[PDB]
């Protein structure tokens, strides 16, 4: 039909409009520690204290299977990758540092993402 074909455009355009999000988000992180995810070959515990691991190789791939349906779910994603690591890092940490600056640099993104998106339709 062609209302299915109209709500798989919007879908894609969503995703186009996302992955601008993606890479602006990624630019805040110049150092690169939320790039990928923590290997639980070298953070062996990891996952007895994280119940969800979150990175941004995670995200782009959930990104390019048009896997987020709206902007409410690709925050979520972001803020498991901030709130996994205020978590397992301690306030004094370079990499709980890391986390809050990402937080207050991508809250001006994410801020300006969803008058676009509500705009846009
Ligand atoms: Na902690």
Not at 29 to 43: N, T
């Amino acid at each position: 039909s062609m209302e299915q074909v109209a709500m798989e455009l919007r879908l894609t355009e969503l995703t186009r409009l996302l992955r601008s999000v993606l890479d602006q988000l990624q630019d805040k992180d110049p150092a690169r520690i939320f790039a990928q995810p923590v290997s639980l070959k070298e953070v062996p515990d990891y996952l007895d204290h994280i119940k969800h691991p979150m990175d941004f190789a995670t995200m782009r791939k959930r990104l390019e299977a048009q896997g987020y349906k709206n902007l409410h779910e690709f925050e979520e994603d972001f803020d498991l990758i901030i709130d996994n690591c205020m978590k397992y890092n301690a306030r004094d940490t370079v990499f709980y540092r890391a986390a809050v600056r990402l937080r207050d640099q991508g809250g001006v993104v994410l801020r300006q993402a969803r008058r676009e998106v509500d705009s846009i339709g």
